[PDB]
Design a protein around this nucleic acid. Structure first.
Lengths: 194, 105, 77, 144, 255
RNA sequence: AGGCGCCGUCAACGAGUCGGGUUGUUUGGGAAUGCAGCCCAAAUCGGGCGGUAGACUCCGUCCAAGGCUAAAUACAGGCGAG
RNA sequence: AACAAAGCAUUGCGAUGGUCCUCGCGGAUGCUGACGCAAUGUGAUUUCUGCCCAGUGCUCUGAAUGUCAAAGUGAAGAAAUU
RNA sequence: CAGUACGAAUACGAACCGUGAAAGCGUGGCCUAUCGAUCCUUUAGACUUCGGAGUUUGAAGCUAGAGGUGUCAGAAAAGUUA
């Protein structure tokens, strides 16, 4: 279909044509703006329009800024204390992805709202940038819309945190189905190790 | 150390002759590589940088003492054999020649 | 006359056709980026070399937005 | 002596293969392979048990040969045939019958001892180079 | 391995710090509005007050000029010869008199200066401590560079826009005379950032230092220790160029 | 509006994704589990999978980078009872 | 008789100091500046402090020759592997 | 080693040669017997095998010999504590 295809086609090509110029220029902004930024426009309406975007009250879009690299593990210079299969500080990298951390940060600050989904809005050389959709549960317009009232249900509070986001399903291995998928579905704690 | 001719006559093991013919002697090493082996189990199993059981490369090691260390390669068929245990060191070869007898000079 | 010799939009179209034919075949030997060097390298190396270097930059792409949108349009009729 | 870890003996079944000795089957590699995937099963029964249960097998029709002497498709006499890839007839101990056995594989000294007038029959899947040429026809049975 | 060697204790902590509250105030050189041939910054020294944070004196200067923002004040670094009732001039057409501050460009070559900037408007870095001074060797009308020799003898290339004060710092010769009470050393330590008294490394038992241990006291290993060495290891003569008394010079130093 | 039959035909099909390397973690998962991190990087009748990698017709299956969704399972038990 | 001490030596440090704490921000350096700060040796005075750079440590210059990783790069080559 | 492995011997047969007149002798050193598993790697020979077909590449493997273990029936490996 429509106009939404072109910007989607652009954003493939982060490095090329108009998109490397315009988004490297918006990083002059992105470095300046905080690790909470609420904005009133999605940067990608295409991938808003395909992760759940309707303009309608209770909807916010927000940019989150997350550091690049792994994780560094306490205590350095009072170090463990244990045998070296378990010594690791920068060597280990989190097995949550940088996208999920952004989901957590966002849902903590906007505590009355619940993360729907999220997307990628670039990286420079130490920050990785995401824009995240959080959707009010508590207001009538979300409730009287049957495309987005499934979020309202009390079971769905703090869903980013319990890994029920799309990002949270993907790092949990739930992308496949079949062969393989056998240690991920229904849960990484699932059999209790019986 | 040893005179061993590089060029000898011997029986074949192999099933295309299964009789006696001329054979060529050579000392052998290569190693592998392209990685499917122990080398892989190590690459993966590093696992905190641990070479671990990739060392039995040491003790500081040393006692010296072998067996014959050969492959004798046919110069008339390409089928050709390695030999069984008895006790050498060290080993000389070159193209032989000879421990020549006899000397007046 | 020159460039190339010769023709113009059909020649852009041959080159534009040769480029997925070069690209799908790199994709069917993985990566992309080293095979895009190898698939080009294991070959004569002139017209393809310049054409490959621009696709490994930045690139085309307003024109790419123009051609893909027409092909998408004309495979959506 | 005891703490059952000084006279006991020892704790876990080791010192047993390495350096003390007896027991398990011990010191392993050795073949390993094929995986859990392209694997078993071929169901196999010797022709003497179909000869047990010829006379009492009165769900299998007798035909050209006398009433004891039955055509019987062995695929529909073998328990756990349906989860097996194929049903094979093995050749041990006599046949004293004038049978006609249908199989998905048969031994060469599996036809030969019941040569005693027989028709030994391949099912279509015995080949197994037979034409599932998109088409139609033959099938494998299904049951618990 | 060991209990932590004192050199990590620098680290952070109330014991390693100076009494920073006690220090008298910031003595930054007033970034001139503009002009300054006499008196859009005119000062009178009214007082000369000791600085505990460096042990040499400041001169209390007022400084009274207007605008809004206007900024004025306060206790500028003393030079030798500054007295109550002397005029201080701070800027580009200040008189070349001891105690006045102006950019190096305005200073005549061969004049001893103190409180010299690294970078323009940082207000003044080099030549600070008691009786020290930089010497401005070269300028020329140097659009590009003013060459100054710091008290160690290193020749530093600085932007001519860097301001300095004419004269050498007050309190010279402080170093000459011996403390001659342990107690004099003690109070002098209390004021500054330092854990004193210091026990020798050799004196301790092994856990406390690389030097420690051994029936008789002695450094078990060679004293001079690695640039590569980590903190805790790096003690003694760190990466020493030479040792023992003979055959060197002062630092020479190229550009 | 929905269904069936006939008629052509087809678009809501989701990009730093698929994919490769560098370094790790984890897994029964082995060249072949799943995930993290740095670098690179497609196509759009085209693509993805089938337990190492590369031609074909295909064969056989399936359309990711989106979502929701009742019931059945658990509860070394707040709360009621045997 | 041990430690400290004042006194005597080497060494690192040109500032966003080197050095200590810290993932980091930052801090401690220092709101100080080589007559200063750290790191160390020895230990009032008085007379003095010889010879050794082979080993070990450390440091210097290396625009040139044997060794010296990865990547990008070249060769065989469908890859990759050498 | 009285039943326990590698080793070693004491003989054969099968294949295959020599010398020798040949009968025979010749299964390493006058005799009394003179050393190394296990993964891996190495090669040898032929053959087996890696999950739609089809085709190259390697892999996996049987059987046998050589590369470390003298802590010699098989650990990857320095001291002090007053």
């Amino acid at each position: 279909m429509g106009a939404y295809k072109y910007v989607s086609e652009l954003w493939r090509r982060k490095q090329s044509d108009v998109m490397r110029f315009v988004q490297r220029v918006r990083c002059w902004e992105y470095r300046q703006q905080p690790a909470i930024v609420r904005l009133t426009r999605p940067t990608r309406p295409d991938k808003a329009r395909r992760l759940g975007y309707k303009a309608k009250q209770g909807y916010v879009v927000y940019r989150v800024r997350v550091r690049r690299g792994g994780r560094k593990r306490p205590v350095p210079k009072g170090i463990v204390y244990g045998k070296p299969k378990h010594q690791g500080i920068t060597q280990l990298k989190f097995q949550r992805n940088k996208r999920s951390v952004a989901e957590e940060r966002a849902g903590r600050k906007l505590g009355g709202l619940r993360v729907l989904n999220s997307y990628w809005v670039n990286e420079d050389s130490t920050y990785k940038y995401f824009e995240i959709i959080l959707v009010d549960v508590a207001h009538s317009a979300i409730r009287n819309d049957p495309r987005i009232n499934w979020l309202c249900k009390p079971v769905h509070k703090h869903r980013e945190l319990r890994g029920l986001t799309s990002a949270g399903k993907k790092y949990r291995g739930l992308r496949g189905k079949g062969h393989t998928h056998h240690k991920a579905r229904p849960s990484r704690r699932a059999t209790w190790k019986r | 150390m040893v005179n061993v001719p590089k060029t000898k006559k011997t029986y074949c093991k192999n099933k295309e002759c299964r009789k006696h013919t001329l054979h060529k002697v050579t000392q052998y090493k290569k190693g592998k590589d392209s990685l499917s082996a122990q080398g892989k189990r190590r690459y993966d199993r590093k696992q905190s940088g641990y070479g671990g059981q990739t060392k039995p490369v040491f003790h500081k090691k040393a006692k010296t003492t072998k067996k014959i260390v050969l492959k004798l390669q046919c110069q008339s068929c390409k089928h050709y054999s390695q030999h069984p245990i008895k006790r050498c060191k060290h080993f000389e070869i070159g193209g032989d020649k000879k421990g020549k007898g006899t000397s007046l000079f | 006359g020159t460039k190339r010799v010769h023709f113009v939009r059909n020649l852009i179209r041959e080159v534009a056709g040769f480029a997925p034919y070069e690209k799908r075949i790199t994709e069917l030997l993985k990566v992309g980026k080293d095979k895009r060097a190898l698939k080009v390298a294991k070959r004569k190396l002139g017209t393809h070399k310049r054409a490959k270097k621009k696709r490994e930059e930045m690139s085309s792409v307003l024109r790419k937005m123009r051609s893909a949108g027409g092909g998408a349009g004309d495979k959506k009729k | 002596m005891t703490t059952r870890f000084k006279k006991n003996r020892k704790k876990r079944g080791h010192v047993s293969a390495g350096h003390g000795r007896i027991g398990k089957h011990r010191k392993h590699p050795g073949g390993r392979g094929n995986a859990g995937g392209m694997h078993h099963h071929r169901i196999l029964f010797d022709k003497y048990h179909p000869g047990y249960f010829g006379k009492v097998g009165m769900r299998y029709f007798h035909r050209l040969s006398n009433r004891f002497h039955c055509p019987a498709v062995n695929v529909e006499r073998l328990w756990s045939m349906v989860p097996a890839e194929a049903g094979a007839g093995a050749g041990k101990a006599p046949v004293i019958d004038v049978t006609q056995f249908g199989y998905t594989k048969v031994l060469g000294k599996g036809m030969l001892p019941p040569e005693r007038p027989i028709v030994v029959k391949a099912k279509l899947i015995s080949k197994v180079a037979e034409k599932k040429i998109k088409a139609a026809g033959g099938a494998v049975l299904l049951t618990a | 391995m060991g209990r932590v060697i004192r050199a990590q204790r620098k680290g952070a902590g109330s014991v390693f710090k100076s009494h920073t509250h006690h220090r008298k105030g910031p003595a930054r050189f007033r970034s001139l509005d503009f002009g300054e041939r006499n008196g859009y910054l005119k000062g009178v020294v009214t007082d000369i007050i000791h600085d505990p944070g460096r042990g040499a004196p400041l001169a209390k200067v007022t400084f009274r000029h207007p605008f809004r923002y206007k900024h004025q004040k306060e206790l500028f670094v003393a030079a030798e010869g500054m007295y109550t009732g002397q005029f201080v001039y701070c800027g580009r057409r200040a008189t070349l008199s001891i105690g006045n501050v102006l950019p190096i460009r305005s200073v005549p070559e061969g004049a001893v200066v103190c409180n010299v900037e690294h970078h323009v408007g940082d207000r003044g870095v080099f030549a600070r401590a008691s009786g020290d001074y930089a010497i401005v060797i070269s300028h020329n009308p140097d659009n590009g560079t003013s060459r100054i020799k710091l008290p160690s003898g290193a020749k530093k290339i600085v932007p001519s826009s860097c301001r300095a004060m004419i004269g050498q710092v007050a309190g010279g010769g402080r170093t000459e005379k011996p403390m001659l009470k342990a107690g004099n050393a003690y109070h002098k330590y209390r004021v500054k950032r330092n854990c004193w008294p210091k026990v020798r490394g050799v004196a301790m038992n092994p856990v406390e230092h690389p030097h420690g241990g051994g029936n008789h006291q002695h450094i078990g290993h060679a004293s001079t220790v690695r640039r590569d060495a980590p903190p805790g290891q790096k003690v003694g003569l760190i990466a020493a160029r030479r040792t023992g008394r003979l055959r060197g010079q002062a630092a020479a130093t190229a550009a």
